[PDB]
Symmetry: C3
Subunit: 243 residues, 3 copies
């Protein structure tokens, strides 16, 4: 029964699943999960065939389901410039998790969290494009699920400037060989796909409900707050030893 | 009178119009028309000097003139996860037409319509960047108006997953020769123009009113519901036979 | 005291500030200031490590703090197609200033202001990608503040088509040598940063308040309405004569 052609069709499907990761036919993904004090989750999907580059602005990072604005916004724009009796908005996120999956090269990831104005450092002419805390690759945890590999990074936004967050996120698809996905003979085909797809969001009342209704349904790699991995698992198939 | 310099000035204008298509000085365009049950039309202009790449998200595809939301949105996010007494929103589009015009290379077009979550296939790790139905080039109809050529593709969204649509659209400007518009000596000049222009929309109470007030006024190639071509026409001018 | 190591640490900081402009580690910026009849200012930050490309649509250019819409919008979409008793919205901007700063190559800037439909010229097939008024480089004023250089361009929107404005803005970082920032060995690293950062806006009740709470606080080069330069100043340091 193990060598039945029907089983080999199943083997084909599973070899396809693992090889599809490395193939040019798959997308890379970064999912940004935002956890609020009401226990709800806002989720952003960032995705591209070869290159993810996105800003999540303040309005993308606050809870837009359990929600004049300028009175508060002016106070997070300039020091002591507010006219609000509310010091910190309830709907600012408590914590985040970044899940990088598909064929990401984690060594190329950047997660650059700033305050409301997006300006690193003391003034715009002194801002660095890559502050040290944006070089997050080595702080991701490498998770495995069978032959699948994904990466997680989680943290707290806090009660300071980054409690009114903006975030720039970018990552490249891993290229294990030398022909660049932006080499002149390829560039125009990938440039045509620079916005496949624009950032997309959803909201869920709790993490447990999101796991059942979205994480499992879309087979998105994930780790819950209690540190349980929720991910599809494709066991490795190979006819010969691997180094 | 036919060889009067004034007539030759007119000839210059019309030769200019046809040659401007192929020139680097013109834009390419994809117009996405969305037709609603109330007979109104929402229109997106997608445009670039050399490379169009855009996502139209759900909120871009529903009727935003003849209009809590999460009760419904949750039900199109996950299976059986809704809390809405409304099964299908009235403002979801009935049908679409894609008009590709200017110097598009129709062979490079992709029109990838997904459901609300934008995720092709059974799970994110198995999604294909190019599902077969996105390779729409050969399904466009080639329309001519004098020396102008444009392409149309129309269809129905339906009452299933794509009745809650998202769409990725991309196309390149035709290059009849070998120097790429993203070749190293050109790339930075076109990259600077990657967002010339961001997607732009309008709305019109009926197709007939849109034809008079917008299609004709902007000289946009178009085909009405009764299959009438509305397009400028520049008759070909040449001093010698053409193969 | 002038050669104390503490003073040399200060010299290092100031040499760093000037050299950081030319370094790949800094961003380029275009700030778009929009001045309304109520004396308030809406401000857009456009920024990238190497290449700025942005559209500011109509809704980005009107005053969104001191604020059915289609009755008016239809009248700026098509000629005589409106159904509004209001001929011109109060919240359309009176004037603009463009500040280009950081290591911009001003020779690569374009500021292309159109009316509401974004369509240059008489029809879409005749639109030019670069109308003459978009080639604004030589109309910028070159301002200096010590070793810092920045560029300003200001003007009026008016009471015609451009009184309902849209704008495309793009500029490249100056490259004083031959290795392109989009050369094949660099392109993928900068493409990953194409949306670092998406356009970001703020609003301020008056120019004077914005100067104290934002221009000074972020050390953004600026010129007030009375023609006063507000900018950080780093005096030049060099051990030898300069041509
Ligand atoms: N968690 C919390 N902090 C509050 C509350 N009310 C006031 N605060 C204070 O506001 C402070 C904001 O400044 P920080 O000390 O930087 O707080 P933080 O970002 O959590 O701390 P760091 O880890 O040092 O960055 C917090 O430390 C709290 O002490 C509250 O209701 N909850
Ligand atoms: N057109 C229409 N369909 C309705 C209505 N109410 C319920 N439905 C049903 O809802 C169904 C949704 O599933 P499908 O069978 O996939 O409909 P569809 O997308 O138009 O059909 P396909 O062409 O096969 O994709 C439709 O087929 C209708 O039978 C209605 O008011 N109008
Ligand atoms: N400034 C101003 N103009 C008004 C007002 N009411 C009507 N208008 C007129 O509306 C006209 C709009 O057309 P234009 O002549 O092109 O005005 P403009 O854009 O300022 O002038 P140009 O510099 O020639 O482009 C203005 O010239 C005014 O004469 C008003 O309250 N204020
Ligand atoms: Mg903190
Ligand atoms: Mg259907
Ligand atoms: Mg005018």
């Amino acid at each position: 029964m193990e060598n039945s052609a029907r089983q080999v069709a199943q083997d084909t499907r599973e070899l396809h699943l693992l090889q599809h990761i490395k193939s040019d036919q798959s997308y890379i993904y970064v999912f940004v999960f935002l956890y609020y004090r009401d226990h709800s989750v806002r989720v952003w999907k960032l995705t591209n065939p070869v290159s993810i580059s996105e800003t999540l602005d303040y309005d993308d990072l606050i809870n837009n389901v359990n929600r004049p604005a300028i009175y508060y916004r002016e106070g997070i724009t300039g020091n002591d410039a507010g006219d609000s009796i509310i010091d910190k908005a309830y709907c600012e996120p408590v914590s985040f998790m970044i899940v990088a999956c598909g064929d990401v090269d984690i060594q190329t990831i950047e997660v650059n969290i700033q305050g409301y104005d997006e300006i690193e450092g003391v003034g715009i002419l002194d801002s660095n494009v890559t502050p040290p805390y944006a070089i997050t690759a080595t702080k991701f945890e490498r998770k495995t699920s069978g032959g699948y590999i994904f990466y997680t990074y989680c943290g707290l936004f806090g009660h300071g400037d980054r409690g009114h967050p903006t975030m720039a996120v970018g990552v490249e698809k891993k290229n294990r060989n030398a022909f660049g996905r932006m080499h002149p003979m390829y560039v125009a085909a990938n440039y045509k796909r620079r916005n496949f797809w624009a950032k997309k969001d959803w909201w869920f009342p709790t993490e447990g409900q999101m796991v059942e209704q979205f994480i499992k349904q879309q087979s998105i790699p994930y780790v819950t707050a209690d540190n349980v991995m929720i991910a599809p698992c494709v066991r490795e198939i190979r006819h010969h030893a691997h180094y």
